[PDB]
Swiss-Prot record, chain B:
Ligand binding (glutathione): 10-11, 38-39, 51-52, 64-65
Gene field: GSTF9
Keyword Ribonucleoprotein among record annotations: no
One function term, GO molecular function aspect: salicylic acid binding
Organism: Arabidopsis thaliana (Mouse-ear cress)
Enzyme class: transferase
InterPro entries: Glutathione-S-Trfase_C-like, Glutathione-S-Trfase_C_sf, Glutathione_S-Trfase, Glutathione_S-Trfase_N, GST_C, GST_Phi_C, Thioredoxin-like_sf
Listed name of the protein: Glutathione S-transferase F9
Keyword hit for Cytoplasm: yes
Gene3D superfamilies linked to this entry: 1.20.1050.10, Glutaredoxin
EC number of the protein: 2.5.1.18
Domain GST N-terminal: 1-80
Length: 212, 205
Protein backbone atom coordinates (compact mmCIF):
# COMPACT_ATOMS: atom_id res chain seq x y z
CA UNK A 1 0.00 0.00 0.00
CA UNK A 2 3.18 2.09 0.05
CA UNK A 3 3.01 4.55 -2.88
CA UNK A 4 5.67 6.07 -5.08
CA UNK A 5 5.02 9.25 -7.07
CA UNK A 6 6.52 9.72 -10.55
CA UNK A 7 8.00 6.31 -11.39
CA UNK A 8 8.84 7.12 -15.05
CA UNK A 9 11.53 9.60 -14.01
CA UNK A 10 15.09 8.83 -12.87
CA UNK A 11 15.34 9.86 -9.17
CA UNK A 12 12.26 7.86 -8.21
CA UNK A 13 13.93 4.74 -9.59
CA UNK A 14 16.47 4.97 -6.74
CA UNK A 15 13.50 4.26 -4.47
CA UNK A 16 11.93 1.71 -6.77
CA UNK A 17 15.03 -0.49 -7.02
CA UNK A 18 15.49 -0.37 -3.26
CA UNK A 19 11.89 -1.47 -2.75
CA UNK A 20 12.24 -4.34 -5.21
CA UNK A 21 15.60 -5.46 -3.76
CA UNK A 22 13.85 -5.59 -0.39
CA UNK A 23 10.78 -7.45 -1.70
CA UNK A 24 8.44 -4.73 -0.46
CA UNK A 25 4.92 -4.45 -1.93
CA UNK A 26 4.15 -1.01 -3.36
CA UNK A 27 2.19 0.93 -5.95
CA UNK A 28 3.07 3.87 -8.16
CA UNK A 29 1.23 7.08 -9.01
CA UNK A 30 2.07 9.00 -12.23
CA UNK A 31 3.06 12.67 -12.16
CA UNK A 32 2.99 14.80 -15.33
CA UNK A 33 6.10 17.01 -15.16
CA UNK A 34 5.63 18.31 -18.71
CA UNK A 35 2.23 19.87 -17.87
CA UNK A 36 3.49 20.88 -14.44
CA UNK A 37 1.44 18.56 -12.21
CA UNK A 38 4.48 18.55 -9.88
CA UNK A 39 4.08 22.33 -9.37
CA UNK A 40 0.31 22.27 -8.70
CA UNK A 41 -1.25 22.28 -5.16
CA UNK A 42 -2.18 18.54 -4.99
CA UNK A 43 1.43 17.42 -5.37
CA UNK A 44 2.97 20.34 -3.43
CA UNK A 45 1.21 19.04 -0.31
CA UNK A 46 3.32 15.88 -0.54
CA UNK A 47 6.56 17.41 -1.81
CA UNK A 48 6.85 21.13 -0.98
CA UNK A 49 9.81 21.61 -3.32
CA UNK A 50 7.74 20.31 -6.22
CA UNK A 51 9.98 17.45 -7.39
CA UNK A 52 9.63 13.67 -7.72
CA UNK A 53 9.72 11.27 -5.97
CA UNK A 54 7.44 11.50 -3.01
CA UNK A 55 6.40 8.44 -1.06
CA UNK A 56 3.19 7.99 0.94
CA UNK A 57 3.19 5.09 3.42
CA UNK A 58 0.04 4.77 5.48
CA UNK A 59 0.04 7.67 7.88
CA UNK A 60 3.62 8.43 6.83
CA UNK A 61 5.00 10.86 4.20
CA UNK A 62 8.65 11.11 3.04
CA UNK A 63 10.58 12.63 0.07
CA UNK A 64 14.18 13.00 -1.28
CA UNK A 65 15.04 9.85 -3.23
CA UNK A 66 18.06 8.81 -1.08
CA UNK A 67 16.18 9.53 2.18
CA UNK A 68 13.53 7.20 0.79
CA UNK A 69 16.22 4.58 0.10
CA UNK A 70 17.49 4.81 3.69
CA UNK A 71 14.00 4.64 5.16
CA UNK A 72 12.98 1.58 3.17
CA UNK A 73 16.30 -0.08 3.98
CA UNK A 74 15.91 0.53 7.71
CA UNK A 75 12.21 -0.27 8.04
CA UNK A 76 12.77 -3.51 6.15
CA UNK A 77 16.30 -4.16 7.39
CA UNK A 78 15.63 -7.73 8.46
CA UNK A 79 14.53 -8.99 5.04
CA UNK A 80 16.40 -9.22 1.72
CA UNK A 81 20.05 -8.15 1.34
CA UNK A 82 21.36 -5.64 3.85
CA UNK A 83 21.85 -2.54 1.78
CA UNK A 84 23.01 -0.63 4.86
CA UNK A 85 25.73 -3.14 5.81
CA UNK A 86 26.03 -5.11 9.04
CA UNK A 87 27.98 -2.83 11.42
CA UNK A 88 27.95 0.89 12.28
CA UNK A 89 31.24 1.21 10.37
CA UNK A 90 29.87 -0.57 7.31
CA UNK A 91 26.95 1.80 7.44
CA UNK A 92 29.31 4.77 7.70
CA UNK A 93 30.82 3.70 4.36
CA UNK A 94 27.39 3.33 2.78
CA UNK A 95 26.49 6.81 3.98
CA UNK A 96 29.83 8.09 2.71
CA UNK A 97 29.40 6.91 -0.86
CA UNK A 98 25.67 7.84 -0.88
CA UNK A 99 26.70 11.41 -0.07
CA UNK A 100 29.37 11.27 -2.77
CA UNK A 101 26.64 10.27 -5.28
CA UNK A 102 24.44 13.15 -4.18
CA UNK A 103 27.06 15.90 -3.84
CA UNK A 104 29.73 14.98 -6.33
CA UNK A 105 28.72 12.32 -8.90
CA UNK A 106 25.17 13.35 -9.59
CA UNK A 107 25.43 17.13 -10.14
CA UNK A 108 27.56 17.12 -13.34
CA UNK A 109 25.72 14.01 -14.55
CA UNK A 110 22.47 15.89 -13.98
CA UNK A 111 23.79 18.71 -16.13
CA UNK A 112 24.58 16.27 -18.92
CA UNK A 113 21.11 14.73 -18.64
CA UNK A 114 19.32 18.06 -18.75
CA UNK A 115 21.29 19.58 -21.59
CA UNK A 116 21.56 16.55 -23.85
CA UNK A 117 18.37 14.64 -23.16
CA UNK A 118 16.06 17.54 -22.26
CA UNK A 119 17.69 20.37 -24.20
CA UNK A 120 14.26 21.95 -24.97
CA UNK A 121 13.56 22.36 -21.26
CA UNK A 122 16.87 24.24 -20.89
CA UNK A 123 16.42 26.50 -23.92
CA UNK A 124 18.53 27.42 -26.93
CA UNK A 125 21.28 27.95 -27.88
CA UNK A 126 22.42 24.98 -25.83
CA UNK A 127 25.20 25.57 -23.32
CA UNK A 128 27.98 23.71 -25.14
CA UNK A 129 30.44 25.08 -22.62
CA UNK A 130 28.58 23.76 -19.56
CA UNK A 131 28.27 20.41 -21.35
CA UNK A 132 32.06 20.21 -21.82
CA UNK A 133 32.70 21.23 -18.18
CA UNK A 134 30.23 18.73 -16.83
CA UNK A 135 31.72 15.93 -18.86
CA UNK A 136 35.17 16.87 -17.56
CA UNK A 137 34.01 17.00 -13.95
CA UNK A 138 32.29 13.59 -14.13
CA UNK A 139 35.38 11.98 -15.69
CA UNK A 140 37.41 13.19 -12.71
CA UNK A 141 34.88 11.67 -10.33
CA UNK A 142 34.99 8.50 -12.37
CA UNK A 143 38.81 8.46 -12.18
CA UNK A 144 38.54 8.29 -8.37
CA UNK A 145 35.95 5.51 -8.64
CA UNK A 146 38.26 3.52 -10.90
CA UNK A 147 41.06 3.62 -8.30
CA UNK A 148 38.65 2.93 -5.48
CA UNK A 149 36.78 0.07 -7.14
CA UNK A 150 40.11 -1.57 -7.96
CA UNK A 151 40.52 -2.00 -4.16
CA UNK A 152 36.83 -2.74 -3.33
CA UNK A 153 34.18 -4.90 -5.08
CA UNK A 154 31.39 -2.40 -4.42
CA UNK A 155 31.50 1.23 -3.31
CA UNK A 156 31.09 0.60 0.45
CA UNK A 157 33.05 -2.67 0.64
CA UNK A 158 32.35 -6.29 -0.31
CA UNK A 159 28.58 -6.02 -0.22
CA UNK A 160 26.18 -4.24 -2.60
CA UNK A 161 24.52 -1.31 -0.86
CA UNK A 162 22.33 1.79 -1.20
CA UNK A 163 25.42 3.62 -2.47
CA UNK A 164 25.74 1.37 -5.52
CA UNK A 165 22.03 1.39 -6.17
CA UNK A 166 21.85 5.19 -6.11
CA UNK A 167 24.01 5.32 -9.28
CA UNK A 168 21.67 3.14 -11.34
CA UNK A 169 19.05 5.54 -12.79
CA UNK A 170 21.26 8.31 -14.21
CA UNK A 171 24.23 6.18 -15.19
CA UNK A 172 21.72 4.19 -17.26
CA UNK A 173 21.08 7.50 -19.09
CA UNK A 174 24.81 8.14 -19.42
CA UNK A 175 25.51 4.83 -21.18
CA UNK A 176 22.33 5.08 -23.27
CA UNK A 177 20.36 8.18 -24.29
CA UNK A 178 23.11 10.62 -23.22
CA UNK A 179 25.37 8.70 -25.57
CA UNK A 180 28.51 8.55 -23.41
CA UNK A 181 28.93 4.83 -22.61
CA UNK A 182 32.71 5.19 -23.06
CA UNK A 183 33.08 7.10 -19.78
CA UNK A 184 32.13 3.83 -18.10
CA UNK A 185 33.69 1.39 -20.63
CA UNK A 186 37.12 3.03 -20.75
CA UNK A 187 37.55 2.52 -16.97
CA UNK A 188 37.94 -1.23 -16.43
CA UNK A 189 36.99 -1.55 -12.76
CA UNK A 190 34.09 0.88 -13.08
CA UNK A 191 32.84 -0.99 -16.11
CA UNK A 192 32.88 -4.39 -14.39
CA UNK A 193 31.19 -2.82 -11.39
CA UNK A 194 28.59 -1.14 -13.66
CA UNK A 195 27.98 -4.45 -15.42
CA UNK A 196 27.43 -6.10 -12.03
CA UNK A 197 24.85 -3.77 -10.43
CA UNK A 198 22.87 -2.91 -13.58
CA UNK A 199 22.31 -6.57 -14.39
CA UNK A 200 20.93 -7.28 -10.92
CA UNK A 201 17.38 -8.65 -11.24
CA UNK A 202 15.84 -5.81 -9.21
CA UNK A 203 17.25 -3.22 -11.57
CA UNK A 204 16.18 -5.18 -14.66
CA UNK A 205 12.62 -5.26 -13.27
CA UNK A 206 12.68 -1.52 -12.42
CA UNK A 207 13.53 -0.75 -16.01
CA UNK A 208 11.04 -3.22 -17.50
CA UNK A 209 8.15 -1.77 -15.50
CA UNK A 210 8.85 1.95 -15.11
CA UNK A 211 10.34 3.30 -18.32
CA UNK A 212 8.83 5.10 -21.37
CA UNK B 1 41.18 9.43 19.66
CA UNK B 2 39.05 10.50 16.71
CA UNK B 3 40.67 13.08 14.42
CA UNK B 4 39.11 15.68 12.14
CA UNK B 5 40.96 17.40 9.32
CA UNK B 6 40.30 21.02 8.34
CA UNK B 7 38.29 22.47 11.23
CA UNK B 8 38.59 26.08 10.03
CA UNK B 9 36.44 25.44 6.98
CA UNK B 10 32.68 25.49 7.03
CA UNK B 11 31.80 21.96 5.96
CA UNK B 12 33.89 20.25 8.70
CA UNK B 13 31.98 22.20 11.33
CA UNK B 14 28.92 19.98 10.60
CA UNK B 15 31.00 17.12 12.02
CA UNK B 16 32.59 19.24 14.79
CA UNK B 17 29.26 20.44 16.21
CA UNK B 18 27.88 16.89 16.09
CA UNK B 19 30.90 15.63 18.05
CA UNK B 20 30.48 18.36 20.67
CA UNK B 21 26.67 17.79 20.96
CA UNK B 22 27.41 14.09 21.60
CA UNK B 23 30.14 14.77 24.16
CA UNK B 24 32.76 12.92 22.08
CA UNK B 25 36.54 13.54 22.52
CA UNK B 26 38.39 14.45 19.30
CA UNK B 27 41.41 16.29 17.92
CA UNK B 28 41.70 18.44 14.85
CA UNK B 29 44.47 18.69 12.28
CA UNK B 30 44.84 21.74 10.01
CA UNK B 31 44.81 21.55 6.22
CA UNK B 32 46.84 24.18 4.36
CA UNK B 33 45.06 25.01 1.10
CA UNK B 34 47.53 27.78 0.31
CA UNK B 35 50.26 25.17 0.06
CA UNK B 36 47.98 22.65 -1.70
CA UNK B 37 48.31 20.11 1.11
CA UNK B 38 44.83 18.92 0.07
CA UNK B 39 46.03 18.00 -3.42
CA UNK B 40 49.11 16.11 -2.24
CA UNK B 41 49.27 12.29 -1.79
CA UNK B 42 49.17 12.05 2.05
CA UNK B 43 45.85 13.84 2.28
CA UNK B 44 44.44 12.24 -0.87
CA UNK B 45 44.94 8.86 0.86
CA UNK B 46 42.39 10.01 3.48
CA UNK B 47 40.08 11.98 1.19
CA UNK B 48 40.46 11.04 -2.50
CA UNK B 49 38.50 14.06 -3.80
CA UNK B 50 40.89 16.38 -2.04
CA UNK B 51 38.24 18.19 0.04
CA UNK B 52 37.64 18.68 3.77
CA UNK B 53 36.81 17.16 6.17
CA UNK B 54 38.50 13.83 6.58
CA UNK B 55 37.90 11.88 9.75
CA UNK B 56 39.98 9.10 11.20
CA UNK B 57 38.76 7.05 14.13
CA UNK B 58 41.48 4.62 15.06
CA UNK B 59 41.80 2.42 11.95
CA UNK B 60 38.47 3.68 10.55
CA UNK B 61 38.42 6.42 7.89
CA UNK B 62 35.31 8.28 6.83
CA UNK B 63 34.60 11.40 4.79
CA UNK B 64 31.63 13.55 3.58
CA UNK B 65 30.58 15.86 6.35
CA UNK B 66 27.02 14.50 6.64
CA UNK B 67 28.17 10.89 6.44
CA UNK B 68 30.41 11.69 9.43
CA UNK B 69 27.46 13.27 11.28
CA UNK B 70 25.44 10.07 10.79
CA UNK B 71 28.35 7.81 11.84
CA UNK B 72 29.00 9.75 15.05
CA UNK B 73 25.29 9.93 15.91
CA UNK B 74 24.88 6.18 15.39
CA UNK B 75 28.08 5.15 17.18
CA UNK B 76 27.33 7.34 20.21
CA UNK B 77 23.59 7.07 19.98
CA UNK B 78 23.11 6.30 23.65
CA UNK B 79 24.74 9.49 24.95
CA UNK B 80 23.78 13.16 24.70
CA UNK B 81 20.78 14.33 22.74
CA UNK B 82 19.51 11.79 20.21
CA UNK B 83 20.15 13.60 16.97
CA UNK B 84 18.61 10.76 14.99
CA UNK B 85 15.17 10.74 16.61
CA UNK B 86 13.78 7.68 18.37
CA UNK B 87 11.86 5.79 15.64
CA UNK B 88 12.44 4.71 12.03
CA UNK B 89 9.89 7.31 10.89
CA UNK B 90 11.73 9.91 12.93
CA UNK B 91 14.98 8.99 11.31
CA UNK B 92 13.38 9.14 7.87
CA UNK B 93 12.49 12.78 8.46
CA UNK B 94 16.08 13.50 9.58
CA UNK B 95 17.38 11.93 6.37
CA UNK B 96 14.83 13.86 4.30
CA UNK B 97 15.89 17.28 5.58
CA UNK B 98 19.58 16.28 5.56
CA UNK B 99 19.26 15.60 1.85
CA UNK B 100 17.30 18.85 1.39
CA UNK B 101 20.22 20.64 3.04
CA UNK B 102 22.70 18.87 0.75
CA UNK B 103 20.84 18.98 -2.62
CA UNK B 104 18.67 22.08 -2.37
CA UNK B 105 19.64 24.47 0.43
CA UNK B 106 23.47 24.37 0.20
CA UNK B 107 24.18 24.68 -3.56
CA UNK B 108 22.88 28.21 -3.99
CA UNK B 109 24.29 29.24 -0.60
CA UNK B 110 27.66 27.78 -1.64
CA UNK B 111 27.47 30.00 -4.69
CA UNK B 112 26.90 33.10 -2.59
CA UNK B 113 29.81 32.05 -0.37
CA UNK B 114 32.27 31.54 -3.25
CA UNK B 115 31.35 34.80 -5.00
CA UNK B 116 30.84 37.19 -2.10
CA UNK B 117 33.40 35.87 0.43
CA UNK B 118 36.16 34.38 -1.79
CA UNK B 119 36.41 36.59 -4.90
CA UNK B 120 29.78 37.44 -11.28
CA UNK B 121 26.88 39.75 -10.35
CA UNK B 122 24.19 37.76 -12.23
CA UNK B 123 24.94 34.40 -10.64
CA UNK B 124 24.76 36.13 -7.24
CA UNK B 125 21.26 37.47 -7.94
CA UNK B 126 20.09 34.12 -9.30
CA UNK B 127 21.48 32.11 -6.39
CA UNK B 128 19.95 34.52 -3.82
CA UNK B 129 16.57 34.17 -5.48
CA UNK B 130 16.91 30.38 -5.53
CA UNK B 131 17.81 30.30 -1.83
CA UNK B 132 14.92 32.68 -1.03
CA UNK B 133 12.52 30.18 -2.62
CA UNK B 134 14.06 27.42 -0.51
CA UNK B 135 13.68 29.55 2.62
CA UNK B 136 9.99 30.25 1.87
CA UNK B 137 9.32 26.52 2.02
CA UNK B 138 11.24 26.24 5.35
CA UNK B 139 9.20 29.15 6.68
CA UNK B 140 5.96 27.30 5.95
CA UNK B 141 7.33 24.02 7.37
CA UNK B 142 8.78 25.50 10.56
CA UNK B 143 5.31 26.91 11.33
CA UNK B 144 3.92 23.43 11.83
CA UNK B 145 7.13 21.88 13.12
CA UNK B 146 9.50 23.14 15.84
CA UNK B 147 12.61 21.76 14.15
CA UNK B 148 13.04 20.45 10.61
CA UNK B 149 12.51 16.75 11.40
CA UNK B 150 9.84 17.30 14.06
CA UNK B 151 9.79 18.30 17.75
CA UNK B 152 13.45 17.40 18.36
CA UNK B 153 16.77 18.95 17.27
CA UNK B 154 18.60 16.72 14.85
CA UNK B 155 21.47 16.26 12.42
CA UNK B 156 19.30 18.00 9.80
CA UNK B 157 19.19 21.23 11.76
CA UNK B 158 22.89 21.05 12.67
CA UNK B 159 23.83 20.61 8.96
CA UNK B 160 22.54 24.15 8.32
CA UNK B 161 24.78 25.85 10.90
CA UNK B 162 28.15 26.57 9.18
CA UNK B 163 27.12 28.14 5.85
CA UNK B 164 24.10 29.94 7.27
CA UNK B 165 26.56 31.47 9.76
CA UNK B 166 28.24 32.85 6.65
CA UNK B 167 24.90 34.05 5.23
CA UNK B 168 23.96 36.09 8.33
CA UNK B 169 27.52 37.37 8.79
CA UNK B 170 30.30 37.78 6.18
CA UNK B 171 28.00 37.24 3.17
CA UNK B 172 25.93 40.10 4.57
CA UNK B 173 22.41 38.81 4.01
CA UNK B 174 20.99 38.27 7.50
CA UNK B 175 17.66 39.73 6.30
CA UNK B 176 17.02 36.46 4.45
CA UNK B 177 16.73 34.77 7.85
CA UNK B 178 15.46 37.67 9.93
CA UNK B 179 12.55 38.56 7.62
CA UNK B 180 11.09 35.09 8.06
CA UNK B 181 9.60 34.85 11.51
CA UNK B 182 9.67 31.06 11.97
CA UNK B 183 12.93 30.45 10.15
CA UNK B 184 14.44 33.22 12.26
CA UNK B 185 13.17 31.88 15.58
CA UNK B 186 14.54 28.51 14.53
CA UNK B 187 17.95 29.94 13.65
CA UNK B 188 18.18 31.80 16.98
CA UNK B 189 17.47 28.53 18.75
CA UNK B 190 19.91 26.13 17.09
CA UNK B 191 22.72 28.68 16.63
CA UNK B 192 22.60 29.62 20.32
CA UNK B 193 23.16 26.04 21.47
CA UNK B 194 26.45 25.76 23.45
CA UNK B 195 27.91 23.15 21.10
CA UNK B 196 27.70 25.49 18.12
CA UNK B 197 28.95 28.47 20.11
CA UNK B 198 31.91 26.37 21.23
CA UNK B 199 32.55 25.20 17.66
CA UNK B 200 32.68 28.82 16.50
CA UNK B 201 34.91 30.08 19.31
CA UNK B 202 37.44 27.36 18.54
CA UNK B 203 37.36 27.01 14.77
CA UNK B 204 36.53 30.31 13.02
CA UNK B 205 39.04 31.66 10.47
N1 LIG C 1 17.08 15.72 -4.58
C1 LIG C 1 15.86 15.28 -5.15
C2 LIG C 1 15.80 15.72 -6.62
C3 LIG C 1 14.57 15.16 -7.29
C4 LIG C 1 14.39 15.81 -8.68
O1 LIG C 1 15.03 16.78 -8.99
N2 LIG C 1 13.44 15.26 -9.59
C5 LIG C 1 13.26 15.83 -10.88
C6 LIG C 1 12.95 14.73 -11.89
S1 LIG C 1 14.34 13.59 -12.11
O2 LIG C 1 15.64 14.35 -12.38
O3 LIG C 1 14.69 12.86 -10.85
O4 LIG C 1 14.05 12.53 -13.13
C7 LIG C 1 12.08 16.79 -10.90
O5 LIG C 1 11.14 16.61 -10.19
N3 LIG C 1 12.10 17.92 -11.81
C8 LIG C 1 10.97 18.81 -11.85
C9 LIG C 1 11.35 20.27 -11.74
O6 LIG C 1 12.32 20.61 -11.03
O7 LIG C 1 10.66 21.12 -12.36
C10 LIG C 1 15.74 13.76 -5.03
O8 LIG C 1 16.75 12.99 -5.23
O9 LIG C 1 14.61 13.24 -4.72
N1 LIG D 1 14.20 20.85 -15.91
C1 LIG D 1 13.98 21.15 -14.49
C2 LIG D 1 14.35 19.88 -13.66
C3 LIG D 1 13.90 18.57 -14.35
C4 LIG D 1 14.75 17.36 -13.95
O1 LIG D 1 15.43 17.43 -12.92
N2 LIG D 1 14.82 16.12 -14.73
C5 LIG D 1 14.18 15.60 -16.06
C6 LIG D 1 13.58 14.16 -15.89
S1 LIG D 1 15.00 12.95 -15.88
O2 LIG D 1 14.17 11.48 -15.72
C7 LIG D 1 13.05 16.58 -16.61
O3 LIG D 1 13.37 17.67 -17.10
N3 LIG D 1 11.75 16.21 -16.59
C8 LIG D 1 10.73 17.16 -17.11
C9 LIG D 1 10.06 16.68 -18.45
O4 LIG D 1 10.18 15.47 -18.78
O5 LIG D 1 9.45 17.55 -19.11
C10 LIG D 1 14.86 22.39 -14.12
O6 LIG D 1 14.93 23.30 -14.99
O7 LIG D 1 15.42 22.41 -13.01
BR1 LIG E 1 5.33 9.09 -13.76
BR1 LIG F 1 42.09 23.98 8.91
Amino acid sequence: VLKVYGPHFASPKRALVTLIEKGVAFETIPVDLMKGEHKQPAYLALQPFGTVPAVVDGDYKIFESRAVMRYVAEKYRSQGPDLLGKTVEDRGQVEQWLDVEATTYHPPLLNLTLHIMFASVMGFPSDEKLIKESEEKLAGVLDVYEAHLSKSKYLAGDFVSLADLAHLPFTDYLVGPIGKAYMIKDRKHVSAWWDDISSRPAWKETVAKYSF
